[PDB]
Symmetry: D2
């Protein structure tokens, strides 16, 4: 489909649509004409200010934009994946169209065409203290220097632009400044991350259904009036989701007739998962403002140019560290439920979910892998925004460090996705030891798993099944299986 950019209407899910699903972007002629008219008012104002040799003056200003793009292109490390650079470019484009950046219509159209033709700059992941260097690398590619991916093939930027039918872009007065000042690296990455955090929670709900039924949990933990006696919006909503999906379970109807309560990895699912949902909503609210905001500097309002601090990443740096914590602890709870599934003394199922403990270990070791992933996430959950280091000869003497936070959030998301893939695998196997009177919803998840991953009889490498299920998650196959 088509995402129209007007500088004020971008949603986080539209950033995803462009970056991950490759929807086209466009900008109306009306928007572009108003952008251009503001760009011209800005030129008139600076041309009057300087005269209170015109040719040497303009050529100097153009050289400045180039020197800035080049000197600031100082990232190191592996290139950021293309889905993230596309997200950053969509957010950057939208925020330059918000009306305060005084850039020209041509700069916006340049970014539109790079996105629609998939000329994606090569952006080293590291260098922003929260985003001059990564955005400079984007501009460097826009100028036809450095490297870029053309339809996923790395090459010199000038060759990628040429294969796409584009000309290198020449930055005008203050357009390099505009492009590289702001929070679009952090906010673009975090837009994708918050969408992937939502997808994590959705998958954790579905994978918990399998474990919850295999362990014969009671629905009493999701009683509406209990959940409403402590009405955080997340836990009320999560309780509703679980009640709906457990409807029709014979296993759970039996449990309700003979069980009072379960261990916390079942009974506390609404409190914990609903906290995670609340944090996701918090971050999405921050981003919803941020990706429609002017975060470059200085800014132009049509009659004056004023320097402020809107490039400072603090609100999104804090949000990235917060969501990292919440997701790490979601992963801890899923790992603990996996640890209960394979422990015959807690589950009431055969040890380690194998039919012959004699010469098989079953799924003993994926639980270690899940614990390993939690331990890695506990390192990564240290808040990068609790630190700051002065830059620019102490003139930029407090910084958010939110780029660190955005990048490590991406790894936590990757790791928690593997933990949940492990719960899909082991919860499906655990149900093989039940009478399978699971709800229709649980059975949709179970059947989708079994389309690609067989039940476990003799030992075989769990790694391959985990990777298959992780690929299914990344293709949204369980959300499709059970809306």
């Amino acid at each position: 489909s088509m995402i129209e950019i007007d500088g004020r209407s971008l949603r986080v899910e539209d950033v995803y649509a462009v970056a991950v699903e490759y929807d086209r972007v466009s900008i109306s002629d009306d928007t572009l004409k108003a952008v251009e008219e503001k760009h011209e008012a800005f030129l008139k104002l600076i041309n009057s200010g300087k005269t209170v040799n015109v040719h040497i003056e303009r050529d100097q200003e153009i050289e400045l934009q180039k020197n800035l793009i080049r000197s600031h292109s100082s990232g190191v490390g592996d290139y950021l994946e293309n889905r993230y650079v596309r997200a950053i470019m969509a957010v950057r484009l939208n925020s330059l169209a918000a009306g305060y950046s005084a850039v020209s219509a041509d700069l916006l159209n340049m970014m539109v065409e790079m996105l629609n033709r998939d000329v994606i700059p090569a952006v080293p992941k590291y260098g922003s203290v929260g985003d001059l260097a990564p955005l400079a690398h984007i501009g460097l590619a826009m100028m036809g220097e450095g490297k870029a991916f053309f339809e996923g093939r790395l090459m010199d930027s000038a060759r990628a632009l040429e294969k796409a039918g584009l000309k290198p872009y020449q930055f005008k007065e203050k357009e390099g400044v505009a492009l590289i000042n702001g929070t679009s690296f952090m906010s673009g990455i975090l837009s994708i991350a918050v969408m992937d955090a939502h997808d994590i929670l959705e998958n954790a709900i579905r994978s918990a259904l399998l474990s919850f039924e295999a362990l014969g949990g009671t629905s009493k933990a999701f009683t509406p009036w209990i959940l409403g006696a402590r009405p955080h919006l997340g836990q009320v909503a999560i309780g509703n989701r679980f009640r709906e999906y457990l409807t029709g379970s014979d296993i759970v109807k039996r449990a309700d007739s003979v069980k009072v309560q379960d261990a916390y990895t079942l009974r506390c699912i609404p409190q914990v998962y609903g906290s995670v949902a609340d944090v996701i909503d918090y971050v999405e609210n921050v981003l919803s403002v941020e990706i429609n905001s002017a975060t470059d500097n200085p800014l132009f309002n049509g009659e004056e140019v004023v320097s402020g601090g809107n490039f400072h990443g603090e609100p999104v740096a804090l949000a990235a560290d917060f969501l990292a914590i919440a997701l790490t602890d979601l992963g801890n709870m899923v790992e603990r439920r996996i640890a209960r599934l394979v422990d015959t003394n807690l589950s009431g199922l055969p040890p380690f979910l194998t039919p012959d403990s004699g010469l098989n270990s079953g799924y003993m070791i994926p639980q270690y892998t899940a614990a390993a992933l939690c331990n890695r996430n506990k390192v990564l959950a240290y808040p990068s925004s609790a630190d700051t280091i002065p830059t620019s000869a102490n003139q930029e003497d407090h910084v958010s460090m939110g780029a660190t936070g955005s990048l490590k959030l991406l790894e936590i998301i990757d790791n928690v996705r593997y933990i949940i893939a492990i719960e899909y695998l082991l919860g499906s196997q655990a149900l093989e030891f039940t009478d399978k009177g699971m709800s229709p919803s649980t059975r949709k998840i179970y059947e989708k798993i079994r389309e690609k991953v067989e039940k476990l009889d003799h030992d075989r490498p769990p790694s391959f099944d985990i990777e298959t299920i992780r690929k299914m998650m990344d293709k949204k196959e369980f959300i499709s299986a059970l809306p």
Copy 2:
């Protein structure tokens, strides 16, 4: 004054009023009669359930409540300060009155009288994994065992109750369970913490006025349309506060005539401080639900008793870790502004703010102290809720660890308060090297400082002046000086 408790109307500032300002609490006869009627419905229901020897049965149930209070009284370490135990008791009382805990009117009245007569249990700080043990210690004192403070003097609980004219309380059916299950230790401490976080931000605004004027900052960073181009509510509100307080400054009017922009510790005050305000608001919203919620277990709705997981601390454990991060980074920005004040090459003022660098160090070393405090806060900002350790033979196999988070937030608050006291001290001294054309608002802060702390001429121990200013902050003298 008087705070009336009805189980549904408690605000965080009312918890503060009771705990810190010693306002009386009361519960209307109407509330108490409805609590008692629900308690009696619960007894009828459990008495009918058991009969589908009455005397031995009831005596057994009473012994159970006692065994629970005693066995769970397993905290270690120093006693929590009385203002916090009072906050916890007010939140506990309100949440047992929310209508689902089936306790008797007498238990609530017991807690009312302990608060109004200042019989405050001795509560070891450590033991909750997020709050059985600390709340058990409260109940232990309520039973007249263990220790308590009577009007601030430590003694055996039975002696404290007797000096207050109270009888030890005997817990009825499920009343010990009700008292010790829930989140009131975390939520009571965090209610006081979020009030103190607000007071921190208020003091940081006032102490920044001194530095901002001494460094001759330009008001251009607070231009309304710039701040509104990125309209996070915090930074818009903070900008308004600073514009109002800088009104009437000759220093700033001059700066605006000759300066374009300042370093980030001045120019980025709205982005960073407004992020902190937003986080404070987030936490207050969580607590506003939590302290009016039923977090004990099982719960009673008038016709059935159901076990759920509302005691699980996750939403407030996450909130405590989040606020710890935001406050640590506020402290980093204040420390960096202090570092600019004493550096003659950044400030344009005499080195280290002494009139004779020859044989004096001036205020060189308080900046080290501020850095030391930041480094301590960077340790404490590690999120305790990213971890979990299984308890109760793996039946309580995921826990929030939010008690850790509440307690370390209190230390961060203490440390940031000292950083701000240091900025009050050094910003006031720095203004001695200006023409003092500061705004009327800044001058109110400056004059309040000078009522108790003299300007620096010859070197003298900064420790004593820092402590004086910290005491003034704790008595709210700068908020009084400048509303």
Copy 3:
């Protein structure tokens, strides 16, 4: 007894003897005469340098030392406990006597008399970035200003000195510089900490004996040739200690006849505890150099005065963070063994170690307390020395942050001591459910516990028994019971 100081022979256990056991210090007349002769050579050299008005010159130099002591007295927060300030003073005194500090004999004798008469400066804990401010507070008291404890009573320093029969000390040329530059705050605190870490390991060995016998462990895990197949010195030594102490156990002889192996909290005791012993030895080696080193600045060698960087805390800042980690993980292993003791499915003993699970919880909750303490230690194990913040207008632009690390190590030590007290309590109770055929060594620990703490029948507050056992540990009663 008597510790003689000569600037080159101090051991960490001598620092403990002075600071904690109140042994007297002395300095021979020979040492003092050589110190004085070097002080006089230094004066001659600086008096010749300045002359390539003598009265105004010397008076200026004296005023400088005073200004330095006062201006640098900039700590905040609670006063450090007297045992630590005594340790710091003993290390400071020894390191000024090492021969490079050019101080006078009178300064050393001043410190000797403060220690022997117990006039201990009041030292705010916070302010060093790794130790100007805390050592300045010591000097401030030495000058008779600020506050001090006289035989444990806080008062004005001049009054404490007067009650002790001492005169205030007047610092001579470069003597204030000498006193306040160096690492003695970090190294004094860490000398006590490493002694207390050793005492922790010794107590953990003894408390593990109780659990190991109650769980019927097999001695096969301590087989000498197994431990020697991986000959880290710690695990070989720990294995020898456990073999010796388990000699004579009927329980273990039975286990060896029917068991192949135990869970890791028993079988891996040598690997983990021996790693801890190795780290303790590492730190002691660092301190053994450091407390006999010249860490002030500039230094004097008898013919020239040269400025170097020996005050930089890096080797002891790293050591403090390392030992914090090792002790935190020792506490994790003890907590996991406690978690096994109270879980009937792992221990083979009654659930939660109570004789009547019907209406008692036994020792269910001390395991939560141990988990809580581990979670707190996981926050505190963040390495403060991984951070640095520039001080002194960027002239002191990398600092160790080792004071933070020393102080948080003290809390970890306190917390792990409580975890071990909990294992003493619960391992002794667990043996009540065995036939008591424990070794003579284990029985010495068991009997010492039972001298003050009764076995558990009906529920009672574990807090009080934990505190009693912690007090016994602090009085070294189990090391006395079993050498």
Copy 4:
């Protein structure tokens, strides 16, 4: 060249030689015959034990080894780089030859041929809690299942073995157990890491020479008697290295005539860098024992098979976290020196090292990149070994988490290498603003830089020059330039 393996002589630098420089490994016929004779004694012992149907018994034992390899092959995530898998394989091979693992000569020869023919298993990085899963993946490839790299091309393991002229290996009695139990993943990776940490320190010495001369430092900070007044071995050795390399500097001879002391990033180089050297030596000592130790389980001594805990990673898990901290703080000091170089008020050189601050930013932004890298390292320096999560239904209830620590140490090393590359770049540029009277040693570093990276006149992307210098470091070109 040729590394001969005998189970007891392996050095960390030999692991590097095999893994990184592709030296061949061999095992003498004598070693192999004694390994085989012990394997046969083990078979005799277990065959006698079982008989106190032989065919079904042996076939069962073989199936067990296969089930174990497969079930434990449960890693997730990207494949570990081949240099690390080669290191792990060399350490595993040596430790199985140490004499206690009872494996056959054929298993050792299999590993020898995989290394010498470069058939390197594909090993997912994540899964060990400290190394069943990664070592299982190695064995899986050895069995001809899963994936492997043949001369760097990924393919099915059976195809890689076939292209190399090898047959799949069939694991004999207890040989799969032997292969997958132990610490070789952690210890192999850490052997390469400690070699790369040494190479980091060596490069940091050389890059500091450039900055030290450009800033005109005084050699007084390296005076031998000062450094020996605090004789930690590292700082004495580092001081000697710097004195030797600064010999012949006209710049430094001038500085010594007019300067007393420098800022800490120059004056404290011996204290900090020597601490790092000491930590490196500590880790190398641990590894020197560990890679020659029997860490599998159970172990065989020729007459009995006994289960112990030598697989527990604690000593190397702690060492990996320790070295991570020390290297992070080395990176902080290098970043602070970079921050001094580009600040004209600290350096005395043109702002940001550009000849025309008018329209150029010079090397302003690489300092941000260095700060960004430090902030990332501060996250990664959180100690993974402070945490533990129970595995295997609580039977493996304390684990080292040292695999996490080894992997994140590799990233810290990568990041610090970039920081040092930045100092090479900017220190060389800074010398362009001096009279170049640098020492012959410094000039060797400067000239080697200038062979590939030109001085900066007009702004250009620093990223490319940083990457070039990082590649030069990885090819050891500065150690070659200046031994």
